[PDB]
Design a protein around this ligand. Structure first.
Ligand SMILES: [Zn+2]
Ligand SMILES: [Zn+2]
Lengths: 120, 103, 176, 239, 168
């Protein structure tokens, strides 16, 4: 062979029913599953020699339904709520001084004592 | 938190309702809904167990006063204009009224 | 099944690694060159090195967990897949020799990164033949390509620079 | 050529009788849920697959008892109960947060408030949609809604010992609670029943406490002041 | 004899079916991007890259057939029963202008998607058929690419007087 790129690769495999049932569950945490046994690896009228060569006789929509692991979803919500809860406690610290806004029924309103006082 | 979730599994004995709870949590995680809607709709799931509900409010960091403030407004999702009003086109928004004034 | 096309992916293999792969294949099929079995370092060592070299840069436990599981899965996957689609008929007999001689030593520990770059280039077809989702595909491919970059960095040590000619008994026992 | 195509198209259209539009059957039967109507309209195909509503339900076809989900009562403290057409739940039409004035129509399926599809943004799945099992353990952007079911000792005690112990423990807790409360009587009375005349004191003799000042904020927000001086404590005049 | 409609356009067509029929929402008839405007834009973009004069000629005559067929077809097999009132109102308002200058891509794509069943009755030469169909394919791709500018963003609610007028 003589090619300049030939940007591929080739290697001779054995029968692909164990290899392709793992590469599915690689990134997954759910262990692989099996199937009916006597259909898995038979001769199918092919008796093979030792050499194991050939035996002769643009946008897109949000469209799917996903199956997610309940472990990750739970562990994500605990981390998702932890950050949001700390952010709320961070802004819960309220220390402000004003005179004539009405803003909330908040924590620091001795303000209203000021504009009502000098007259009374 | 692990205690909270095994107790939720205990209380919600029906796997369909448990899955709906988890789906609500996922909505929050992704950011479609916020903490107000999360708690106001989790009350309908977890109210039968005071321990579970107090634990959930402790997780969310929501005081009971603030929960009572947010409940009625963040439970049912209705349009802001009410369920019976709707906006008009700009064309028919200036039909003549020869007796009106600026006031 | 969607709008008829959805484009196939590609791992941006470094050109140096491309040349290495092509020259290695050519020398092993025409010049009867073989791989020093076993090697030093090993596949497990290289994976552990990439782990310790890239882990200190993640800034989230989500990324930490997904990356940890990804690298551990790559270990177990090379374990399960080395003896199917990662050799040729020539060194198939060398594999037979090591398989029958070393009783229970792990194949990931026996082999080296030279058989890891092959899995790294063959991953696109394997992802294509199966049915995973887009985010998982992108995650695995990004980790594989940064692994390839790390290998390009540490080339001088990770790639042995010579082979050995097949012995007469070996070439006669393989025939080809 | 295509000139002739145009001629044949024009001849067809001006020979035939006009009709109303309908997109092809491919596009129509593409999605799940959508379906044509009697006069070419769009109607969702989620209706009661069985066919006035039976107001009071007591027994189920599976023997399961009929108790409301929120109050756990039995369709007799209120003259009507509702059965969710999606789960095995029953709700009083008064226990829902906006209480339903009238029961829904027996034609359309009714969905209880304990489902996540009330707050998802609506979407459409094609009717050839292999459910993909995503392996990414954590951090999966999923548009919130398209995640389908998250697919993955016999003791023979026979004693009432623990039941008797639990009953006595409950009675003891009750006894302690009642004791504490009935001692804090004679002070609950004074601080909760005369609580209507101490506000009168701190109003008449105008002493500034937090609630007085909040009431004055309430009156300012009613009168809608802008930038003038606040008149006085007893002379803002929504009298 | 079949076409390749992108999934975004399929979703948009079904959403428009629902909005116009069940939810009582219509489209503002005077469009900012005109049908003639979009036709001219696509024509210019394709000719600027075409190769030979024979192809130039066939593409030009294809676009001409397209515009004349739109102008002759709109008011006969392109509107729902909830838009005929609006159609007659627009004809009364502008009786001198034409539909190719009035309507938009929201209806041009109904024409495009429905073309297969029409070429089903028509039986001209397969060469012309395949040329026209490839042109329609490229047009659909161009529209779904330039979505941001050609398609309307929000629909308009019909007024009570309009609904009492139509009543169908
Ligand atoms: Zn009830
Ligand atoms: Zn329900």
């Amino acid at each position: 062979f003589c090619v300049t790129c030939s940007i591929k690769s080739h290697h001779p495999p054995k029968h692909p029913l164990s290899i392709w049932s793992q590469l599915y569950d690689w990134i997954d945490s759910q262990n692989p599953s099996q199937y009916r046994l006597p259909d898995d690896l038979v001769h199918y009228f092919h008796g093979i020699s030792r050499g194991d060569t050939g035996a002769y006789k643009p946008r897109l929509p949000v469209s799917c339904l996903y199956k997610v692991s309940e472990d990750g979803l739970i562990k994500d919500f605990l981390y998702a709520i932890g950050i949001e809860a700390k952010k709320f406690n961070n802004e819960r610290k309220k220390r402000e001084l004003e005179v004539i806004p009405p803003d909330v029924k908040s924590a620091l309103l001795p303000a209203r004592t000021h504009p009502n006082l000098p007259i009374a | 938190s692990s205690d909270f979730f095994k107790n939720v599994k205990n209380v919600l004995t029906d796997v369909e309702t448990y899955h709906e709870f988890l789906k609500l949590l996922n909505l929050y995680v992704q950011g479609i809904i916020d903490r107000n809607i999360l708690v106001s709709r989790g009350f309908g799931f977890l109210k039968s167990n005071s321990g579970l509900w107090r634990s959930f409010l402790s997780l969310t960091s929501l005081s009971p006063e603030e929960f009572l403030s947010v409940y009625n407004s963040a439970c049912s999702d209705f349009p802001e204009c009410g369920p019976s009003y709707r906006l008009l086109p700009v064309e028919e928004r200036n039909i003549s009224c020869s007796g009106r004034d600026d006031f | 099944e969607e709008e008829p096309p959805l484009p196939k992916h590609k791992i941006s293999v470094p050109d140096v690694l491309k040349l290495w792969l092509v020259d290695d294949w050519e020398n092993i099929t025409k010049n009867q060159q073989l791989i020093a079995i076993p090697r030093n370092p090993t596949v497990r060592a290289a994976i552990a090195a990439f782990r310790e070299s890239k882990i200190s840069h993640l800034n989230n436990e989500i990324d930490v967990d997904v990356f940890e599981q990804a690298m551990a899965g790559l270990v177990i996957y090379f374990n399960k897949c080395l003896g199917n689609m990662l050799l040729y008929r020539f060194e198939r007999q060398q594999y037979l020799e090591i398989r029958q001689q070393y009783p229970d030593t792990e194949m990931c520990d026996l082999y080296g990164v030279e058989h890891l770059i092959r899995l790294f280039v063959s991953l696109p077809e394997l992802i294509d033949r199966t049915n995973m989702d887009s985010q998982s595909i992108e995650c695995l491919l990004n980790y594989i390509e940064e692994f390839l970059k790390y290998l390009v960095l540490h080339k001088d040590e990770y790639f042995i620079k010579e082979y050995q000619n097949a012995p007469p008994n070996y070439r006669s026992l393989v025939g080809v | 050529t295509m000139v002739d195509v145009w001629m044949q198209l024009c001849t067809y259209i001006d020979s035939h009788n006009p009709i109303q539009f309908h997109l092809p059957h491919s596009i129509s039967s593409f999605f799940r849920g959508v379906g044509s109507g009697v006069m070419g309209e769009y109607i969702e195909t989620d209706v009661l697959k069985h066919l006035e509503r039976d107001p009071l339900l007591l027994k189920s076809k599976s023997g399961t008892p009929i108790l409301c989900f929120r109050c756990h009562k039995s369709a007799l403290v209120s003259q009507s109960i509702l059965a969710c057409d999606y789960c095995n739940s029953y709700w009083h039409p008064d226990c829902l947060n906006p209480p339903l004035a009238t029961l829904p129509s027996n034609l359309r399926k009714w969905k209880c408030p304990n489902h996540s599809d009330h707050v998802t943004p609506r979407y459409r799945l094609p009717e050839k949609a292999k459910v993909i099992r995503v392996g990414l353990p954590r951090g999966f952007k999923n548009k919130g809604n398209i995640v389908i079911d998250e697919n993955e000792k016999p003791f023979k005690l026979n004693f009432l010992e623990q039941i008797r112990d639990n009953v006595i423990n409950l009675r003891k807790m009750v006894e302690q609670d009642e004791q504490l409360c009935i001692e804090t009587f004679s002070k609950f009375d004074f601080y909760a029943t005369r609580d209507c005349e101490l506000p009168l004191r701190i109003l008449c003799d105008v002493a500034n406490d937090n609630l007085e000042n909040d009431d004055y904020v309430l009156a300012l927000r009613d009168l809608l002041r802008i930038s003038k001086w606040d008149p006085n404590q007893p002379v803002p005049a929504p009298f």
